[PDB]
């Protein structure tokens, strides 16, 4: 065998796998945005923004750009818009998602003006 326990916190995130993430909501609840869902050009929930002032940045797992699967055990590459968001309000302490990552294009190219 090549590992015996693996746990979906403080770990990386794999391309080409849907792994999965846990996140402690600890006292405020989560700072992050989703867009796409039902009636939507994209079938694939992801990540608009996430807010630094929440949980889900505290841990820094989720990255703005990310296509999310699953959350709580609740499907939601089907579930719309409104849904997931619902979905992400009803979730305890301990907040799960399955999420889903590209092996390919890595933009080595990925730099703005940085004016100020």
Known sequence: ?????????????VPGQEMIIEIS????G?????????????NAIVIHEVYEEGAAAR????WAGDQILEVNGVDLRNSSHEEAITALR???????????????????????????
Do not use: F, M, N, W
């Not at 909501?25 to 405020?28: F, L, W």
């Open 1 to 13: 065998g090549s590992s015996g326990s693996s746990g979906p916190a403080t770990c990386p995130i």
């Open 25 to 28: 909501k600890g006292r405020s």
């Open 30 to 42: 989560l700072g992050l945005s989703i867009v796409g869902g039902k009636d939507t050009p994209l």
């Open 59 to 62: 841990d820094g797992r989720l």
């Open 90 to 116: 009803q979730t305890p302490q301990k907040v799960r998602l399955v999420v889903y990552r590209d092996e390919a294009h890595y933009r080595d190219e990925e730099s703005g003006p940085s004016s100020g």
